[PDB]
Amino acid sequence: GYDTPLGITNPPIDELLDRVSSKYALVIYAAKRARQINDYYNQLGEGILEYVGPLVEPGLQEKPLSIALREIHADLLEHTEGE
Amino acid sequence: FQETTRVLTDAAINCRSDKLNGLKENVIIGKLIPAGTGINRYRNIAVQP
Amino acid sequence: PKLMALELFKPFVMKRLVDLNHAQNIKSAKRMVERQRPQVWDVLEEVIAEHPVLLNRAPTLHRLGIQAFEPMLVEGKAIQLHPLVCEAFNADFDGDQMAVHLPLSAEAQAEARILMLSSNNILSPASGRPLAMPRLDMVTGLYYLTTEVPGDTGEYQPASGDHPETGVYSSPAEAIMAADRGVLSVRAKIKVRLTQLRPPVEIEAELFGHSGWQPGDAWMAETTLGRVMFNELLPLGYPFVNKQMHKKVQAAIINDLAERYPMIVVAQTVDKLKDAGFYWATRSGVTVSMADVLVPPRKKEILDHYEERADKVEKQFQRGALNHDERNEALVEIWKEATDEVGQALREHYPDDNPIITIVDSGATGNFTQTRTLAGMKGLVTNPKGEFIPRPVKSSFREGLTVLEYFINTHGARKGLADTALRTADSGYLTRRLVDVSQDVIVREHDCQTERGIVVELAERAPDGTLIRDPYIETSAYARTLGTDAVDEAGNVIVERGQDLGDPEIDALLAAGITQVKVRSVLTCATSTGVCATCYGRSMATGKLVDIGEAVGIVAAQSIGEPGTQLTMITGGLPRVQELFEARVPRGKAPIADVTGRVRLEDGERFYKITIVPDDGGEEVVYDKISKRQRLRVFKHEDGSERVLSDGDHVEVGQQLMEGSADPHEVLRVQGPREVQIHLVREVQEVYRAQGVSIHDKHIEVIVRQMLRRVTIIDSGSTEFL
Amino acid sequence: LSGLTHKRRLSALGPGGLSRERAGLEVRDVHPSHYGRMCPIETPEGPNIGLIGSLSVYARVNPFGFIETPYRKVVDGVVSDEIVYLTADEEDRHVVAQANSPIDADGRFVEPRVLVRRKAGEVEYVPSSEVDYMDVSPRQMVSVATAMIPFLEHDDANRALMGANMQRQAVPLVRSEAPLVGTGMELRAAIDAGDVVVAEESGVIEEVSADYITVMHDNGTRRTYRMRKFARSNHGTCANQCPIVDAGDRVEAGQVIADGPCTDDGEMALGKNLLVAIMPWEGHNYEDAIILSNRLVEEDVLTSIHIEEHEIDARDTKLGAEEITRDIPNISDEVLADLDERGIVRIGAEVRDGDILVGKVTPKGETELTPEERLLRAIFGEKAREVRDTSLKVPHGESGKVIGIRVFSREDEDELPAGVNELVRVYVAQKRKISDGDKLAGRHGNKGVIGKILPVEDMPFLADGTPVDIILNTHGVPRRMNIGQILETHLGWCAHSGWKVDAAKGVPDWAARLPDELLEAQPNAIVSTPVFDGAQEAELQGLLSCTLPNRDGDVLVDADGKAMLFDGRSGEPFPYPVTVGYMYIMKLHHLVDDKIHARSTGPYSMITQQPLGGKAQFGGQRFGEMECWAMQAYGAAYTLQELLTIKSDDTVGRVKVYEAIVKGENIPEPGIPESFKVLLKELQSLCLNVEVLSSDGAAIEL
Amino acid sequence: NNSVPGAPNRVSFAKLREPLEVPGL
Amino acid sequence: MLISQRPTLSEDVLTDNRSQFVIEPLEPGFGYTLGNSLRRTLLSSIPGAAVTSIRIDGVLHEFTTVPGVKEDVTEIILNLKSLVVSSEEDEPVTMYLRKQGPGEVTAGDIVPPAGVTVHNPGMHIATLNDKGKLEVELVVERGRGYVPAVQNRASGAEIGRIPVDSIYSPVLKVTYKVDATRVEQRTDFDKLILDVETKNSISPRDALASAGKTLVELFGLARELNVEAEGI
Amino acid sequence: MLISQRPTLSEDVLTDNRSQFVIEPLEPGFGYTLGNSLRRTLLSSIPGAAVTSIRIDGVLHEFTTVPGVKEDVTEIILNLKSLVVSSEEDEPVTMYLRKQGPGEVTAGDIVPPAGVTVHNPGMHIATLNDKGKLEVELVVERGRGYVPAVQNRASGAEIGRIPVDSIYSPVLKVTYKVDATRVEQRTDFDKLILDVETKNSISPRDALASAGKTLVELFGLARELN
Ligand SMILES: [Mg+2]
Ligand SMILES: [Zn+2]
């Protein structure tokens, strides 16, 4: 129940934290996936498709971190916490 | 903090060694501070679709 | 500014520029950026779409001194800052500057977008009270909007014979239409029919039988159109608030929203409130002029009376009866009384429509002492040596001070300007030391399964009244986990063990009649390194249980050191805090009852000699106290501060006798760690609350825990330790 | 004013004096003996508070060095015309009255009890016979700068200090305008500052031009005054002297002939008169911000001229002699079009950021060219051109015309430093119009930064269609306690509109004490309120009800000084009347253009390898420990690691990250700061075996 | 009472006469 | 002259009754100039019809409540004031609503004369108990804008005449905002965001079209004073 | 109770440059908005002509002086900023000013080309000694709004050119008052009295007509929706 968020406040932070134990885990959860997406884009030209690109279809020139957050919010990723 | 020369002499005499588990030492050395996102609990996370 | 953004985002811009084929190679792209060709601005706007930047305003004094904002290109050469974050940055737009950084790697961007974003920092870490809320000009606008004035235009009137009642509107839209036409004041008593605003609990339980209000269910409301317009800003489902929006009311509303709603909704509603307050501050008609600053009508008579009394005192001195000191004391007392009298007369004279009164009473900014100075009597003023001068200034800043009065007044201004720098330096030093001590306090565990817990009084039950909420329950036991279940008189459990305390749980505990509650505290934690999250309890900024890995020592140090700047003056100012944390011998060094029993004191005019006879048995401990001080209240069943230290009474062990501050080491020696911890926490909290600032106890429990963490050994025996 | 104050400074620090650290805080306070000798208000705001002051207006220094002040002795209750100068001791052995004390026209004290200042700073009443000395003017305790703040007696000491300090930062505008309301110190300050040429002898002006003026003295001797124009001052501003006399006009000795910077007809004028409306407006003037009309920008009301100065020199070197030439190695002809045959920019040529200003070639030694560089040199036919490029160029953030060039040559027998043969300095003049971020301030210590510059059609306008030139928030006036601001606004409106005190029935009660010449004023008149003796509240209240109507025949402001404005956007009148009036606004020298800094990658220090550089590449912003604590509290571990390793000290990490950003790859892992390797080497040099060891204890290499 | 010959005429709310003119600053 | 970038209007739909109209881009400063006048024109210039006064034979005055009805007389006035009516007759035509017995009375139960109509027959007016009745006479008159009833207090002389504030408008709430736009380096062009909510009598698009028609007709007065070169 | 009579506009003339326009009857509460719309469009969107740049013989930049004149180049530029001209041509045109010998040079000494005229021949530009002369060439262009002098900075012209800030705005002051007729009868309206003063470049009637055409063309977009 709220007006649609716009900018870097989308997706809403509470809905993201609903899926991760704590924000300190969420930051890594998003950063590692952003690195994976960036590596996939870098190797798009030629290379083994070991890193799978974005799951949710990206927008017109959307940053890898934003895509990572959006696909985290869509329940398409799984993470295991160290120690 | 204070009295740098005296503490250096004392440490050299005692041959004391300090663990790098504090925020200040990690900041000085360039290591991730052992708080927030720098603890191995959160640093070592495996994420795949 | 686009110039700074271009010079700061240059590598990203140049990569995208070569990518779009505008430039053939990196060298050409760099040359193009240097020359600032028109092709660059589109790429620059395209490359900072969602790239947060960190804004820092030195001297960063607490955690919220660094925020992360989404950049936007703007003309000019000044960084546009949001009105609400100035409270956190402590920034006034009078030439202040703040540096802007830029996180590059994905991890840094995620850190600055998840943790440091300005939308996630509505609540202050120190006390959990909203820091990004309508502050100075928004408060005045909202206060004007939500005020009710009687006998206005278009107010509700009852049926009169053949004339039906007027002022009943079928919807807020009709009320707005009437206001636009000009037949209805925004703030007048009206009876509107609301449909998209939830009624208050009292009305909700009656009209709908608590069945549940849903949008589309109409209920008659008696209020002013201003309040209806205000509540439209609050999130749907929030019960209708029908009260004038003094600053405290706004703070309560914001805190409740933050407690019951996600932070995104809180940010949205805070922004909407800011917009409405700014819009309605322009039309509140608050200005300043000679007509608006009214002189008290009968100031001359009061001044003449008190001047006559002062002249009588002066003549009494000239008889030779009194020396300089008594004369000065009498004059200062008389002039303090005169200043208070003139202030009361001025307060009575002013109406409620003056811009000065509206600004001060609305809580927007300022206090009434400034109003009295500017329109009443500036009063007696300090001397460079620090003592009041017997001569007061009887002219206000409106009438105009004379030459001598202005010269005498300059002393206080010079003293304050000089002391500002020293105070800030001392606060910085104290913060540095506090950070150094509590470097190693980090939450390492989720729960230590410990049984120890400090017992903190919730609300003492008066002998006649059923209950009286403790004045500082908001700071002692508000965000603490419950160490043991609070069992009522019967077997029913009001709050289960381990459930974090809060407003509803505290209210339930008060209703059940329980007064003493044991709360898990960081000061009795069992974790070897750091402090488990359960013992530390609910976090302040987040509002939920503190998550593992969070550095609580740095937060505590920053919270304690932040209000040092405004912590103005046995000195009871910042030096009191510094000596209390340094565990030095207090200047007063009041004696303490070494052993409980009956007191047999002898009054020595030169040096007070105190002796106590233990009830159980033993000898009398002798204290040689100087006679130049004043006795403090003796602990008695009445506990009346006016009471004097009567001889032959019985005093509990560890209770001080004379005015001053007990030595922490002596109280620790005679009573134990629990009592010394209570003493330190209470003393520092008292010195902080005297000025007006509030910081939760746990932020001090951390420092005390790190402080009292050694065991002096007297005899090694079979241990290598010397 | 800034120079005049600087000359009359009393600095208590420096060689032979106390130091900031060693000096106690007790010496920084005011003393009852400062009355008349050292101004208790004017003082630096920074750490040098109380160690720097200024002579009072009437103070004269004794031969022994002790400061003196004038006092007119009263022999037997009758004040004497003759004065005597008393030092501190003589004053502390006597009974000194106050100038404001009501005095009969014959010198008789009307009040039996006269307020008296006596030894030890004591102030108390005394019979009118024991009094021995009396002051000369109520303005005897204030400095020159503090003596030109109207209604100073209504402003608090700290606000007055701030206003006095800010009056010395005003920038001289293109067109100066004297204040409508200002004390009597303006003219004397301007005359004694020395920036206005004043006729030495009485005569008749023969011919006056923009450059010079010749006046024929009565004794038959002509004298010509040369007026420096557009001459750079010590702080970058411009100093112009425009003659204010016409040919064939007799000039009396000591009369001003031309107006220097900040002067309007031989009286100090640091700012312009603007129509102020005091109210909050949409939050754009929130918390000390200021809203301005675009009419100020388009009319060049607050336009200023600043002159930069650059210089390069050709010094002889061991490898050869540096020379200035139009020819430069491998630069396109278009970039070198503006230069002249001698190798320096032609006068009057717009020069932009980074443009070449004077071309010089330095001798080169021997350096084998890189593969592709030498190959291209061979292919294109361009020889190596060993001589390097060291041409002076416009630094970052500079522009404007080239007003003048000054070249000194050793060949022409000019005194230059040893080892230097040719030195040329180019002056660049820039015209700045007020913009967002610039600072403005009144005389009452109420600063502000331009929050917005609204179009002339958005500003609130009076009932007759006159838009207001500036809007000031009302929440900062009563909290700061500088009501003199509002008093000045009211009196400025009264002066601008002109008044006509009714006298057909007789002078009103409130106007009994007004000077006979002050009962009428033409529109846009000039009035003065001397410090500590000026217009009382009753005077302003009476005058506000007697202002002349406009040309339309209607009075805009009410008796209370408030007027009914119209909303420039909605178009509907504001619900309540608003205070309006003309206020004197100055333009401080804290311009935004100088403050803006930005850095992405530039020069790096040598010993520390940290970011560093000049204005061409602005240095980085320091990230202190308090910032580090703030970052640690958030729990952000990677941001701090980057800020301290990958963009501060990592010599290879910086290059690697710059490669990563300019390419598509990710940012690599940071390395070890140089500030730690340096520490370890420095600590080893002290014969301290310092070695990092792992859990096993094995030493690791760094 | 403008000491300088050609001063602009700005009337003042001066109710007291200063017996001594400001010396050379 | 010429306009750099032509303004264009895009309709958005939030509900059948609501809408959001964005005009973009506009020369700097034209945002308010357009929006405020358009809002006032929409709210005050569009003609409509509404009930002006009511009659209740069963009650001699308004202090008490009409017998046999749960709702208070003021509540009935409030319900009937919200009735949406469309009238094509210039003169004020009378209407009668008659009911008997227990049940609820809805706006669809009123017999309308020729011309007038009711656009929400499902509306609720009041409720009736056993052996209850109510006959009310409500006149419907055309007009524009909002007119209070106190000004309509003086109207001839009758027994139970009860003037009621009539809303002569098919649009009942309009709001506007302006936001910065970047069509070039200027980055200062306005973006008017007009929000309009109407009754069921007129669609938001038709309401905006009528407002534009009226405003163009009004400014034609100035434009036909003389013909001069001007921007398009 | 629809109002039968639609609004009408009538021009009154108070002076050559000033006129009063009366518009009524208007719907209640609507006079202020219409008057303010007209005022806003009058002060910002009336096309006009103004001097764009100048070129003084012997002067390379504006921070200098020409021998013989009593004031520097900046002062004369500021004086010329007050000049009012009306150019019928839609292209830049160049006007000449050649004054020599002792005396004063005024705007009446200019000799504009065909299609241009100067409406204040009494303006004071500079003063000349018998020693020095003054020859100025200034360009007049037709536009609207306020164009900063930078417009000619990038033109890449000779060193002689001195770009000048341009103010194409013939309107000077605009004001309005509304005379509401609130009466107990339904017959309530309001009357508008729009005053407008100009710089003598154009008459008030032409300015009002131009503003009205602007607004009509702007509201055609709203009318189009249907
Ligand atoms: Mg500030
Ligand atoms: Zn624990």
Residue numbers in the entry:
A (entry chain e): 28 to 110
B (entry chain d): 1226 to 1274
C (entry chain d): 444 to 1012, 1024 to 1176
D (entry chain c): 446 to 1147
E (entry chain c): 29 to 53
F (entry chain b): 1 to 232
G (entry chain a): 1 to 226
From the paper:
In bacteria, transcription initiation is performed by the RNAP holoenzyme (Eσ) assembled from the RNAP core (E; subunits α2ωββ′) and the σ subunit to mediate promoter recognition and DNA melting. Group II σ subunits (Eco σ38 and Mtb σB) have a shorter region 1.1 compared with group I and are implicated in the stress response and stationary phase growth. Here, using single-molecule Förster resonance energy transfer and cryo-electron microscopy, we explored the conformational landscape of RNAP from the human pathogen Mycobacterium tuberculosis upon binding to a single-stranded DNA (ssDNA) fragment that includes the −10 element sequence (−10 ssDNA). We found that like the transcription activator RNAP-binding protein A, −10 ssDNA induced σ subunit loading onto the DNA/RNA channels of RNAP.
To identify the nature of the RNAP conformational changes induced by −10 ssDNA, we determined the structure of the EσB/−10 ssDNA complex by single-particle cryo-EM to a nominal resolution of 3.2 Å (consensus I map). Here, the EσB/−10 ssDNA complex displayed the complete cryo-EM density of the σB subunit (93% of σB resolved) with the C-terminal domain σ3 contacting the β-protrusion, and the domain σ4 inserted into the RNA exit channel and contacting the β-flap. The clamp domain (β′ residues 4–423 and 1219–1261 and β residues 1041–1147), attached to the main RNAP body through switches 1, 2, 3, and 5, rotated 22° orthogonal to the main channel, and adopted a closed conformation (red). The β-lobe (residues 180–370, blue) rotated 3.59° toward the clamp, bringing the β subunit gate loop (β-GL) close to the σR1.2 and blocking the access to the active site cleft. The β-flap rotated toward the β′-dock and was fastened by σR4 in a conformation found in all RNAP–promoter complexes structures. After σR3–σR4 loading, BH adopted a catalysis-ready conformation. The EσB/−10 ssDNA structure displayed a well-defined cryo-EM density of nucleotides from −13G to −4G with a resolution between 3.0 and 4 Å. Nucleotides from −13 to −5 interacted only with the σB2 domain that encompasses σR1.2 to σR2. In the Mtb EσB/−10 ssDNA complex, two DIS nucleotides (−5T and −6G) contacted the groove formed by σR1.2 (residues σB-R28, σB-L31) and σR2.1 (σB-R96). In the EσB/−10 ssDNA complex, −12 T interacted with σB-Q148 (Eco σ70-Q437 and Taq σA -Q260) and with the invariant σB-W144,145 residues of σR2.3 (W-dyad, Eco σ70-W433,434 and Taq σA -W256,257).
